[PDB]
Amino acid sequence: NAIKYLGQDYENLRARCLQNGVLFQDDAFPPVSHSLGFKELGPNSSKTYGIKWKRPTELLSNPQFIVDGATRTDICQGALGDCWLLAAIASLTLNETILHRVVPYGQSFQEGYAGIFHFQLWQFGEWVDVVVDDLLPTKDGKLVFVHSAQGNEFWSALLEKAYAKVNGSYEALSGGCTSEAFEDFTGGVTEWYDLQKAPSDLYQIILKALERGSLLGCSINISDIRDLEAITFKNLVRGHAYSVTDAKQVTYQGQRVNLIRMRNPWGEVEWKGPWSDNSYEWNKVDPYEREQLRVKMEDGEFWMSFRDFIREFTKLEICNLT
Numbered sequence: 001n002a003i004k005y006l007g008q009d010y011e012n013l014r015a016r017c018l019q020n021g022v023l024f025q026d027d028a029f030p031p032v033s034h035s036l037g038f039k040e041l042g043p044n045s046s047k048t049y050g051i052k053w054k055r056p057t058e059l060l061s062n063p064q065f066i067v068d069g070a071t072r073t074d075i076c077q078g079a080l081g082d083c084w085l086l087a088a089i090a091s092l093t094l095n096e097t098i099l100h101r102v103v104p105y106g107q108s109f110q111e112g113y114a115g116i117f118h119f120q121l122w123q124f125g126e127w128v129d130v131v132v133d134d135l136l137p138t139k140d141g142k143l144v145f146v147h148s149a150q151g152n153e154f155w156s157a158l159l160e161k162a163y164a165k166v167n168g169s170y171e172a173l174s175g176g177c178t179s180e181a182f183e184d185f186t187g188g189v190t191e192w193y194d195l196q197k198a199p200s201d202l203y204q205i206i207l208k209a210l211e212r213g214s215l216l217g218c219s220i221n222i223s224d225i226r227d228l229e230a231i232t233f234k235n236l237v238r239g240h241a242y243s244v245t246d247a248k249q250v251t252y253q254g255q256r257v258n259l260i261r262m263r264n265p266w267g268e269v270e271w272k273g274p275w276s277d278n279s280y281e282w283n284k285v286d287p288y289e290r291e292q293l294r295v296k297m298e299d300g301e302f303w304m305s306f307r308d309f310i311r312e313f314t315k316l317e318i319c320n321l322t
């Protein structure tokens with residue numbers, strides 16, 4: 001029941017292209033440099049050199065919209081500073097209700113495929129349907145911006161494009177606020193917490209939020225804008241949005257420890273402290289908890305004790321829904 005952004009009708013356009021024997025080309029967000037950017041990604045820029053617009057059906061013999069469900073590992077940041085957005089999309093996948101709204105089902109590259117897709121966002125004070133053609137920025141046959149751990153999966157790349165479309169261009173997405181993305185996917189209420197002055201029952205607040213299906217994100221502030229994308233010695237990225245994906249407690253050497261799980265939208269580069277994938281701490285806990293919580297995989301997701309979490313991170317944003 002969403003309203004058509006710019007008046008473009010997904011079903012009518014798809015049927016029309018199928019009848020006319022052609023693939024959709026978006027006049028509202030065309031496959032040209034103006035859709036990429038205006039400065040760092042403008043036509044006269046080095047970052048756009050070699051960038052060509054290609055459809056998934058031109059790159060692979062078997063492109064798929066969704067493979068093994070739409071999940072957080074499907075969100076791997078590319079050469080665009082839109083971590084705030086990607087962390088939001090990753091969190092979104094943990095609430096099927098909202099995911100199913102933002103990403104309509106029944107879309108594929110097989111039957112009825114006409115080079116057009118659509119998504120719904122909370123914009124201009126309402127739920128709007130945004131259409132996009134599947135021409136994506138590529139370099140040497142690979143996606144330049146967001147991509148999935150599954151090489152033949154494209155829903156996340158297409159959603160990022162629709163979000164870029166409503167904002168004017170991909171470059172417009174460089175630099176942002178996680179809460180802004182949370183609201184565009186939920187129309188809900190956002191709150192934030194200063195981890196340097198965190199409430200005594202903040203962990204409980206997180207537990208309930210995660211249970212209700214709220215979206216949570218966190219980040220580490222920097223002294224200035226020069227320490228951009230600076231990795232700490234503990235291997236955390238500062239000035240970078242992370243998705244908070246879980247909160248569980250474990251019994252460590254006789255007493256339970258509050259743990260928190262988060263994911264770097266890069267899909268790699270994880271924390272190297274206690275509770276990390278190859279950390280020793282997992283030996284001092286019971287097998288059940290270890291096998292049920294620990295996952296040894298370079299996926300950008302990792303656990304931290306809540307104690308270390310509030311010391312290392314500076315901000316936590318939470319978006320609660322209906």
Ligand SMILES: *[C@@H](C(=O)O)[C@H](O)C(=O)N[C@@H](CC(C)C)C(=O)NCCCCNC(N)=[NH2+]
Binds near residue numbers: 080081083174178229
């Ligand atoms: C994220 C990345 O891709 O690594 C990138 O650093 C980013 O978006 N940085 C943000 C902060 C994180 C989301 C904590 C940033 O530096 N924002 C300040 C941008 C100021 C304009 N902001 C908004 N929110 N419209």
Ligand SMILES: [Ca+2]
Binds near residue numbers: 067070074148153
């Ligand atoms: Ca997937």
Ligand SMILES: [Ca+2]
Binds near residue numbers: 297300
């Ligand atoms: Ca991991």
